[PDB]
């Protein structure tokens, strides 16, 4: 069973300061894209909404030849969880874990996210972000039930320069990725993020394509 | 108030498994000592319990001329949070958050812990563990109210070579930090551990001394 | 001219014992293809020859749309240096310098390569490497004579295990990089790499391929 | 024999500029202190002299209760190799190499620093920095005959901020070490830092203390 729809939920703090969001959306796990609106919870936010981008769902990312095994865990239910960290340049941290519950075609996800050590006066809380870069991910799977996943990624600035991080994360699956999935490594995938955002709510788009060659 | 005793919750999961722990303490926060007992709430651990050493208390830290940032954030309540990220040499991770209650002179610790990653051949997930090497803290303070703490952190392993580790984290507080802390930096921080544990308990003890300098 | 031919001078140190290494070749700077072959001055060396593999020309290298900075800057003569660190998981490390000179369509490398730190029963002093992964390299240009690069780097062992390096270099040029090739960020580049090795020497090849998207 | 004199060659290059030094100094190797006078090549620097401050001789440096391995190095002639890599926090890079002779008591240390990526209008280029922090580095010894050593570095600057980086290195010895030394890890090295410059010249003194302990 393939997705459709879904809604979010994150959950967590920045720089010590609780925050909470919630969104509904859909896409196509056919072609990798996915689209989600948000509506701020109560009045604006505090930081830079660009910031929530890789927080704002790889079920709907097919692979090549077939399913990717975040489609095939929730197609069998076993399921996975996602634990990334994100370094920022100047000293930033983001640790973030993914939980995910399906009925259907319908994800529902719960994401808790904790932000620390932004500069008062840097780009995240001065809202200085005005794009996320496209990006490629390379995926290794050190065993069955696990993958590494690593990406440098960057935003643009009003300033002109880029606001750069290391982002690394382990999906964990709870059953065995597939013989298939498992002989084709690395896997790499290629993500564009659009986020337009308002005082009071964002919308979102992501657009995933998984690849071993360009050639 | 000045601590003197303390409980600690462990929360969270490893590599995709719950697991939860509780223990109880003493500690002397002039001489920066602790002490800690735990009981596993299931059976043995299904990883060395060497892992947990960071997580197994810096309001027990003294600073040389007077109350720690920690010591002076317990005593009026304020506090702070710690969030904290290692990142280990064979691609396992682990994040941490802290939280804390005060009652007087006792101490409420709240830690999720979340580590993915572990080889399961490894020396985490095979006990090969044998102790923590002494380690010394960097801090910093990039503004008024965050600490940021760096450490290379090594453990002994039976097989001789040693098992290594990058700990980074902030410390957020709610208050800013006094003026004569925020005058001397970096301020170091020496740590000794010792780990005793058996099939069903462990006991924890940890020594920590501030410094400015050796000469 | 567009690059044809090219030679190599490698010279260095590995484990603090020095080596040297002279290789010739030719490329299509067309098509991103190059290769060389070099004979063992002293018989076979004294550690896994899959290890040269990054220090065995981007002038080979077009853009989608024209030529490369790199091309570019050999056709006018101004040139371009790489500084180049690769940092392996097992806490070796190799830093590079790459200088060029050219002859017409020729060009002749003169690098300089020093590793340290390589365990001796590794996987490169015990030749257990295998083959390099397919890579897939960012590039960005903080400002209009550098280039920044990160990789992901990482070889097939015998042993099945994969042994991981990340790769981050600056690309300096004499004369600035042309406004058309700054405007299009992050450039990606595809590189394949081949390598079999005698007793007595080794042939190399390299495809790689620049893109900005890959949907 | 231990050192009382040296003479410094640094040569290579900062943003593909090359640059070279030479200087003469003194120090005392029961007591871990050097001072050293150098004189710029040609004109002033492009660049922050502080930049230069871990370029400006652990032959100095004594152990606690005996000769450290670099002096033990020295003593017999068999010598070490360092092989340093810094990575700044606006993406900047360094990578040295020193490699050194021995007439008696007289060190000559041959040094080639090249350093890529500093931003023209970042602290070093436009030269902000005031004074190095004092520093802890951490030793462990992998194998009998290398050192490596880690460290957080700090600047202060005229901007109210620190400019951080991180270092690195092997130390790579002809000659086994010694097994009173090989037997104490971690040792750490306190270190201090003090610079004058001119138009034309700088003044540099250092103050180095191992330890493996403080309490």
Redesign the interface.
């Known amino acids: 069973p393939l997705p459709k729809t879904h809604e979010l939920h994150i959950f967590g703090?920045f720089?010590?300061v609780e925050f909470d969001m919630v969104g509904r959306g859909i896409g196509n796990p056919n072609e990798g894209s996915e689209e989600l609106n948000a509506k701020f919870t109560k009045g604006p936010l505090k930081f830079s909404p660009y910031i929530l981008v890789p927080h704002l769902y790889y079920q709907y990312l097919p692979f090549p030849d077939g399913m990717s095994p975040f489609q095939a865990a929730m197609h069998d239910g076993s399921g996975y969880?996602v634990?990334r960290?994100i370094?920022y340049?100047?000293?930033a941290?983001v640790?973030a874990?993914y939980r995910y519950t399906y009925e259907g075609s319908h994800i529902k996800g719960e994401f808790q996210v904790?932000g620390?050590?932004f500069?008062?006066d840097g780009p995240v809380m001065t809202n200085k972000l005005t794009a996320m870069?496209?990006?490629?991910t390379?995926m290794?799977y050190?065993?069955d039930?696990?993958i590494?996943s690593?990406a440098?990624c960057?935003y643009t600035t009003t300033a002109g320069?880029?606001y750069?991080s290391k982002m690394?994360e382990?999906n964990?699956?709870?059953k065995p990725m597939a013989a298939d999935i498992l002989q084709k490594?690395?896997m790499?995938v290629?993500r564009?993020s659009e986020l337009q955002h308002s005082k009071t709510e964002l919308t979102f788009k992501e657009?995933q394509?998984a690849?071993?060659?360009?050639?």
């Open positions: 703090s720089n010590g969880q634990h960290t370094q340049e100047d000293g941290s640790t874990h904790i620390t050590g500069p008062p870069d496209w990006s490629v390379k290794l050190p065993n039930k696990t590494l690593t440098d960057s320069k880029r750069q690394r382990n964990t699956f709870a490594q690395p790499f290629f564009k657009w394509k690849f071993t060659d360009v050639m």
